[PDB]
C-alpha cells in the first residue's frame with residue numbers, strides 16, 4: 001500500500017533542502033514517499049486551500065463562473081500580480097489571497113465548516129478567522145490527506161456539483177505538452193513555524209494518473225522554485241515524465 | 243473589424259509554403275490575417291471535425307464522459323496510435339478517425355444535420371457517407387467560419403449542454419505553461435484535393451483570448467510540423483506568446 005523510497009532524499013539534499021514528496025499511482029493503487037513520518041504530518045494549507053475554497057464558492061453561487069471578474073479593491077499590496085483584476089483562473093495562478101478572503105467571508109463559518117467536513121479535508125478545523133484560518137488558524141492538512149482530497153476531485157466524488165469540480169480542475173491547469181498534463185496548486189506557509197512550501201496536484205498521462213503532494217522547509221523565499229523542481233526530479237527519476 | 247498584414251506571408255514563403263493564418267482578438271473584437279480571401283476559402287474540415295463530432299456525441303449520450311473507453315476494433319490501420327483503446331481525450335490527441343466514425347454512425351444523418359445547422363457550422367452539408375462526410379463528402383468550412391464556431395464554443399454559447407462544451411474544451415488542451423494555454427485541433431485533409439493541413443483553436447492569456455485558424459497546402463507529409471510552427475511564428479511576431 002505504502003512504500004518508503006529513501007533514495008528520493010538525494011533530490012532534497014542536492015538542493016540543501018528537506019521535506020517530503022508523496023506519489024500515488026492511481027492504476028496500481030500504490031503510494032510512495034521518501035518519508036512516511038513527514039508524509040503524515042499536518043501543516044497549514046496556505047494557498048493550497050484555494051482548491052476547496054473555490055469549489056465551495058462555486059457550488060454556493062458566491063462565484064458564478066471562471067469568467068466573473070473580481071475587481072481590485074484599490075489597495076496596493078506586496079505581490080505585484082495581486083494589484084490587478086482577477087477571475088477564478090488568474091486568482092489561482094497568482095494565489096491572490098484577498099480574493100479568497102472575500103470568498104470565505106461570503107461562505108460563512110457554518111457553511112465552510114460543514115463543507116470541509118463533507119470534503120473530509122484535513123483536520124476539518126476552521127478555528128481562527130473565517131477568512132484567514134487557512135493561513136494562521138487551526139486548519140491543518142498532511143500530504144497524504146491532500147492526496148485523498150485530490151483523488152476525490154479527480155473522480156468528481158466530492159460533495160459538490162460536477163460543474164464546480166470541472167471548473168476548479170480547469171483553474172488548476174499548470175502545464176501541458178504532448179507527454180503530460182499537470183493540474184496543481186502551490187502554497188507558501190509563512191505565518192506560523194515551520195515555514196514550508198507546498199505543491200499538490202497530479203500528472204495526467206495517456207493511461208494513468210499520478211497524484212503528488214510535496215512540502216519542504218522554506219526558511220527563505222529564494223527556494224520557492226524548488227517546490228516544482230524537486231517534484232519534477234522525483235517524477236523524472238521514476239520515469240513518469242521525460 | 244478586419245485588417246490584412248501581408249508581412250506574415252514571409253512565414254509561409256520562408257518555408258516554401260502557402261496558406262493563411264487568421265487571428266481574432268476577443269477583447270478588441272478585431273481580426274488579422276495575411277490573406278483576406280483565403281481566410282474565407284472553405285475546405286474539408288478533416289480531423290478538425292473532431293470538435294463538433296465530440297460535442298454532439300456527448301450531448302446525445304453516445305459518449306458518457308471523457309473516461310469511457312472505446313475498444314480498438316482489432317483492424318490494424320496505418321497509424322499505430324489508432325491501433326489501441328482510446329477515450330475522448332486520447333481520441334482527439336491522436337486524431338483517431340475510427341472512433342469518430344463510430345460516433346457519427348450512432349448520431350445518425352438526421353441528428354448530425356440538425357446539429358450542424360444549430361452550430362451554424364460551415365456550409366452545413368453532410369452529403370456523403372454519414373461516417374466520412376468530413377473526410378471526402380460535401381461539408382466545407384473556411385478559417386473564418388472555424389473561428390466563428392470556436393468563439394461560440396469558448397463562451398459556452400453553442401446549442402449544446404455546458405457540460406458537453408466543457409468536456410470538449412478539456413479534450414482540446416494541447417499546450418500550457420506560465421505564459422499561455424493553447425486549446426486546438428490539428429487537421430490533415432488527404433482524401434480530396436487539394437491536400438491541406440489545419441490548426442484551429444485559441445490561445446488563452448491572463449486577460450485576453452486569441453482565436454486562431456490556419457490552413458496551408460500540404461503536398462508532402464514532412465511539412466505537417468509547419469502547421470504549428472508557422473502559427474507560433476506569427477504569434478511570436480505579434481508578441482502574443484514569448
Ligand SMILES: *C(=O)[C@@H]([C@@H]1NC(C(=O)O)=C(S[C@@H]2CN[C@H](C(=O)N(C)C)C2)[C@@H]1C)[C@@H](C)O
Pocket residue numbers: 045046047048079094095097135186187188189224
Ligand atoms: C499562498 O501560499 C501564499 C502566496 N502563494 C505563493 C506561492 O504559492 O508561491 C506566494 S509567493 C509569490 C509567488 N512568486 C512571487 C515572487 O516571488 N515574485 C513575483 C518575485 C511571490 C504567495 C505568498 C499566500 C499565503 O500569500
Ligand SMILES: *C(=O)[C@@H]([C@@H]1NC(C(=O)O)=C(S[C@@H]2CN[C@H](C(=O)N(C)C)C2)[C@@H]1C)[C@@H](C)O
Pocket residue numbers: 287288289290321336337339377428429430431466467
Ligand atoms: C485528420 O485530419 C487526419 C489525422 N490527423 C492528423 C494530424 O492532425 O496530425 C494525422 S497525422 C498522425 C496524427 N498526428 C501525428 C502527427 O501529426 N505527426 C507525428 C507528424 C500522425 C491524421 C492523418 C485523419 C483524417 O486521418
Ligand SMILES: [Cl-]
Pocket residue numbers: 097135
Ligand atoms: Cl499571506
Ligand SMILES: [Cl-]
Pocket residue numbers: 024144147148151
Ligand atoms: Cl489515498
Ligand SMILES: [Cl-]
Pocket residue numbers: 169170173411412415
Ligand atoms: Cl483544462
Ligand SMILES: [Cl-]
Pocket residue numbers: 339377
Ligand atoms: Cl483518412
Ligand SMILES: [Zn+2]
Pocket residue numbers: 253256257471472475
Ligand atoms: Zn519559420
